[PDB]
Design a protein around this ligand. Structure first.
Ligand SMILES: [Mg+2]
Ligand SMILES: [Mg+2]
Ligand SMILES: [Mg+2]
Lengths: 370, 374, 372
């Protein structure tokens, strides 16, 4: 309605968390005007030593970024035979890798590393495919799930824990003892759990995998300000159907990201490692958000809103979740070399010496080092 | 303004009904929370012997399944010739078991060519991206003085689109006298939207050629078959391409004695259920785990199954045969039985607490089909 | 809340104006029930002699029709080959009668190259699924200090540069602070439309065509020597429009001529009378007339989707523009249908005989344009 008529943005932090015998789940309230406008909601899910996230799915696509830690995920796709014990061709993800969890598709993840895996997943709760509502939803196939988004309700069992065990028994062609097992009416290990001892194993082919970190195929490289890598439907076609792309901006010492904006896409920045200055301006040239942003914090970017950032004394590296398979952007210092001189003159009231300046002066990169 | 955020679902039956000369129109209110979460409404239509349904068009598509009866139907596609001595457009014939797709904005008339009354359940996809108006259902009649089918959209008068135009401007627009054009306002017709054509029509008695209808009933089914619980037929885009432009689909399911429809859910679509024949148990479980609906469901009722919600059905001693509307040209669903045999063995034993023995029992036991029997 | 169950529709009038040093900008309030059911809003822009509209951009696409004057428009498409001491992108000239389309987030600037004011009708497709903000319209100026063009959301207005600081800004571009400070336009009164004393000696995806003329009878598909003609510009003509879901159709209706009752199957429609006057009739699904009355040269009329619209020209004809929210809006007229429905049908339908039936099916000559 007016979801974006916001005259002030925040660097929001998780408003909910759930303890677990396997890991930890931190969620960002979905009702914050910031996330309300962009029509999304993020969730920081962490996997302790040998963490195993029990299967579940959502009525909306999920773009997840593994910043710290590594592991292995498994999809439960329909039809596709369990070519990989009859299990689907399981997948192993690494740090800096990007994945897009299809809607209504149950998924399970296991930590195959020493360091606790920390991942950030963008819940496109306003996506095309989602035909329910804004309020996020998670349907777990197992375990006794502990509410991750209390806003939805304002107990909690899996989907199997809703049918009388006699029914499942007949359905699965088994006894009732095993039936109750599926109902998990007793278990109290919450969402994530740890696999003791270890774990064996040591369209259908639409590579839903892609590492964004790989500093090989970026876009701009300025060894005094940093670089920025983008991921979209071009390299990762799959994204096309879920309409979501991301970028991993890295700002060196005082490195600056020229005032840029997003044409056809909202943005939500996530500070991974670092601390820096960030400014966002709307129509009336207002500084809707002019402050510091560092690790853990999240910042929304209202589509055409203009934003610029500079790495702090410690530096600044983050990831941006945009809502469009092929999100485009442009930095003001580029528009200049696009608009004719005489137009720039009559616009800012500058002689041709200053106009001939802004253009040919500087480099062809939004990454500037003061 | 919370839509699908619901803890309980109510099986619904016709709210309003139109009693016309040669037909009947029963419509379910769109203001029903269960339907609102689906963004659709339904309209049961019954064409009495020799009954004709006055032409009309809606700002959104419609998926209709003729359950009982037969007849002829023709659309008024602009830009299409009268190719198929009269001068009409290639008229199409429909029989029970056929799924009809009425495009948005396109006028259409239907006629019952049989002796028994025709019965079809039209799923009004008002929340389609084609309707640029609003949520409420709208029908524009070209003739007669009909009764408001969906009186909720009004919250009682009516008339064809022409009843608004004066015979003057009308007689002039269509270059005709003040008599013909005068009747074109139908200031007479008490017959309403559906009229009895005593005697019948001698005529019978790509956008133009695109196959819109198809049969979903006939045992030509090739989806899932269990000759102990039933069978399931599907009609998506892959079969009826025309659906893509309208983003819809529907399934036909038959559950024999003790027919059990193992737990399944729709990966990307709101499911509306209408029972054509039968009476059984229907369970719907959301995310919290609890059941938003558990009870008996008899023929003639309607039920909504919100997208990712998990549902399961079982037919009584008399079986269970019903039609299911799915808002998506390619609604994809899956059953838990296929999930277990999809996730690594040791991944299940750590979840619901099981062991290699009983775990290998759920992966290799029973019929690979979702239709099970006790 | 229901937004299209409009009881009575009226003729929208520009209820606002932004006086600019080198021009003027008008806008139809975006709160009108009629304009809301269509999910749009129009903005009448005028560029006096040597008038120049400062660069800007909206999160939604825009379709404009030049109803007066000539000039030039320039875009700043990200990542393009500046084919042309001075390097700028591809400038594009435009005469009157041309229909322009502005991609969202794309900065554009228009300069009047003639002496007579340049007037254009801008359609702000705010309801487009390309605008992930809200319904409220928004303009992002890359320069000057613009006033509020849409106050229905402000209840001053610098540029996206005034938001930054002359310091950081000076750094982000590498230049003295005297430069960057001006890049904020602190003491600028000229507004969004300025005058270029002496004109510009310059004027005298980066491919896809954006504008195309409409007025020309070449794009006409319905000509009635005694009632006027109709010109259509849609997806198949301008492929680019496919990505913005917008179609333009010009209507030339001579005196006493008529546009037989018809309707749009898949789209809303905003009508703007560029010249003439006449009578307009719009019937809703309830078989009633939501709108009925005179329509002069300078008014806006909303025509909901499936609604049936019929209008007869006036003494001095009636040339109006049509904005259809669909890259290829498909319309059809009642008569064209009577020539497609079996002979026996129309019969029992309205109660006619083989005479009156064959009357319409025959007498009704194939053509939406009728000259009574
Ligand atoms: Mg950024
Ligand atoms: Mg079902
Ligand atoms: Mg018109």
């Amino acid at each position: 309605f007016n979801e974006c008529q916001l005259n002030n943005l925040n660097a929001l932090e998780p408003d909910h968390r759930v303890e677990s015998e396997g890991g930890l789940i931190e969620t960002w309230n979905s009702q914050h005007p910031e996330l309300q406008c962009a029509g999304v909601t993020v969730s920081k899910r962490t996997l302790n030593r040998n963490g195993l996230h029990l299967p579940s799915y959502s009525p909306y696509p999920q773009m997840i970024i593994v910043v710290q830690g590594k592991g292995a995920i498994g999809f439960a796709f329909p039809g596709c035979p369990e070519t990989f014990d009859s299990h689907q061709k399981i997948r192993h993800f690494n740090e800096g890798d990007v994945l897009v969890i299809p809607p209504g598709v149950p998924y399970w993840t296991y930590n195959t590393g020493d360091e606790p895996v920390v991942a950030i997943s963008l819940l496109d709760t306003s996506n095309f495919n989602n035909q329910l509502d804004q309020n996020p939803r998670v349907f777990y196939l197992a375990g006794n799930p502990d509410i991750e988004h209390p806003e939805t309700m304002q107990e909690g069992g899996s989907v199997l824990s809703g049918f009388s065990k006699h029914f499942l028994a007949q359905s699965f062609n088994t006894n009732e003892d095993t039936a109750e097992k599926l109902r998990s009416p007793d278990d109290e290990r919450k969402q994530i759990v740890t696999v003791e001892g270890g774990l064996s194993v040591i369209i259908c082919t639409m590579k839903l995998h892609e590492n964004i970190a790989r500093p090989s195929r970026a876009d701009f490289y300025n060894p005094k300000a940093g670089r920025i890598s983008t991921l979209n439907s071009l390299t990762l076609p799959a994204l096309r159907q879920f309409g979501l792309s991301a970028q991993y901006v890295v700002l060196y010492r005082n490195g600056i990201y020229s005032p840029h904006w997003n044409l056809n896409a909202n943005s939500v920045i996530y500070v991974t490692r670092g601390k820096g200055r960030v400014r966002v301006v709307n129509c009336q040239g207002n500084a809707v958000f002019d402050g510091e942003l560092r690790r853990g914090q999240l910042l929304v970017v209202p589509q055409n809103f203009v934003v610029a950032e500079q790495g702090g004394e410690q530096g600044l590296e983050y990831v941006v979740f945009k809502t469009h398979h092929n999100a485009v952007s442009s930095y003001i210092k580029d528009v200049f070399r696009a608009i004719p001189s005489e137009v720039l003159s009559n616009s800012y009231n500058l002689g041709q010496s200053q106009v001939r300046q802004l253009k040919y002066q500087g480099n062809s990169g939004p990454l500037v080092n003061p």
